[PDB]
Amino acid sequence: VARGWKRKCPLFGKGG
Amino acid sequence: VARGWKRKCPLFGKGG
Numbered sequence: 001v002a003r004g005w006k007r008k009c010p011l012f013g014k015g016g
Numbered sequence: 017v018a019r020g021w022k023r024k025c026p027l028f029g030k031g032g
Contacts, residue, residue: 009025015032016018 002011018027 005029007023009029009032012030012032013021013025013028015030016028 004010005012020026021028
């Protein structure tokens with residue numbers, strides 16, 4: 001894992 | 017836009 005996939009998707013977001 | 021990119025990224029998540 002990169003960071004901490006929690007609420008406010010920091011990295012794993014727009015990626016879709 | 018697909019859904020509603022808010023807190024708990026529903027769609028735009030792991031995609032990244």
